[PDB]
Amino acid sequence: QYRVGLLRMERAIKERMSSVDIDTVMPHDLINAKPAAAAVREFFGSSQLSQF
DNA sequence: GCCCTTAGCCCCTTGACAGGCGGGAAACATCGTGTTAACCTTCGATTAAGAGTCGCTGAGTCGCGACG
16 A cells, blocks of 8 residues: 555656756655555555454 | 591603614625746556346358349
């Protein structure tokens, strides 16, 4: 599930890096963190394996 | 024992507030528009390790006969 979240984050970073230039760019400014923690939250929030 | 006189209770008249829903007038936070023009002109899941049956389609096999 973290690999799925990382694939989503990679898609987001690929969609966002085309707009923001890489030369003189603020570090880690295009990498998102919502789908990273959202995947583990769903895994521990309402997953069938983490049900109880 | 009954009638007259006076006191207490009930009722009426006025009223000086108090503020209180509510529209208006105003000061201030919404909600639908625009507008800008420097680069990519196919994104992506999701069953599919049981099970009884409804509704449609399209291939290979035969009859009936005509023309040599």
